[PDB]
């Protein structure tokens, strides 16, 4: 089963397969680039997460980030449980050198459609994973 998410590392692995991928090391330091996941199903049974060859901000996916400004530092950090409000969520993690794979599993229908963001940081480079999960599709 595929991971609806973003692979930022240059390590292509069969242990985890991502729908989208963007090599972070090829992104400029001053660029505002994001990789976008949009789920729109009546009921869900999906893996969502990312593979970051650097550092993950915040501690995704137990914490996520909902922004309201083009700020440099988040500090507006919410928790996935309160944001999705689907009850018990299964969280995952795996390593592969500097590669950090963080996942979560969503099963069922969510009350209100919600969006959140996770940041992959490599040196001065920074890419956003923005996911949107629809309520009814």
């Amino acid at each position, epitope marked *: 089963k595929v991971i609806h998410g973003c692979n930022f590392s240059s390590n292509v692995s069969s242990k985890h397969t991502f729908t989208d991928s963007l090599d972070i090391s090829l992104v400029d330091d001053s660029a505002h680039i994001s990789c976008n996941v949009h789920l729109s199903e009546p009921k869900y049974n999906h893996l969502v997460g990312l593979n970051c060859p650097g*550092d993950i901000i915040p501690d995704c996916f137990f914490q996520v980030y909902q922004p309201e400004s083009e700020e440099l530092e*988040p500090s507006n950090i919410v928790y996935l449980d309160s944001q999705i409000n689907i009850g018990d969520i299964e969280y995952y993690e795996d390593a592969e050198g500097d590669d950090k794979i963080k996942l979560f599993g969503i099963v069922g229908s969510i009350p209100k459609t919600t969006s959140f963001t996770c940041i992959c940081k490599k*040196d*001065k480079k*920074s890419a956003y994973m923005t996911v949107t999960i629809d309520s009814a599709g």
Partner: antibody
Amino acid sequence: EVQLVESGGGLLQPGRSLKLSCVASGFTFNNYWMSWIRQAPGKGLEWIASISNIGGTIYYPDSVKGRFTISRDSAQNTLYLQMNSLRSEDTATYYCTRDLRMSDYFDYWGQGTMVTVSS
Amino acid sequence: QFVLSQPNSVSTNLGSTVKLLCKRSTGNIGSNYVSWYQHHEGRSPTTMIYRDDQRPDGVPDRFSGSIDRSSNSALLTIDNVQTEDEAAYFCHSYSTGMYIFGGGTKLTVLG
């Protein structure tokens, strides 16, 4: 304001166990990386350990890898650095910092604690 | 990943101008942010410069951070040197997984 107050430490012998405390206050504790920085006598600053907001990421250099353990308490607002199987080399002034991971610097430093290991 | 190199010790006079270097061994100095820390003896280090050229509140306009790409090194510049500036200065930079500190430069204000 933000305050970082360290505790623990003292005089130990090689092979024992120590646990330092760092009580943080004045900010949302679960939203910041925390680190431990030491300064050996007659030496420069040396990084020891870093932990993320909820411990989703932990780093060590190869010197204290396996010997030291860094963790935190969300409710007590305290950061710890468990020290086991020490050495005379670990005799240093141990500092506690709050980190801004997105900017890769330490914006607030603790008052510093002294750990002396000798036989 | 790399090593930051600083002069062991330097010395200038009052009201003069000193530049403390921080040479990165391998890689580009601009690929990673650089931070500067002032350390007095028996005192906690205080942040002097963050992400290359930013100066936190409470740090005098005297101190400024700069990136010299030709020498692949960062510079902490202190105009109108004061005796209170006499301390140790450390540069810092982070690569994924390891925090790099320079050796530190013990500044001396010839008073």
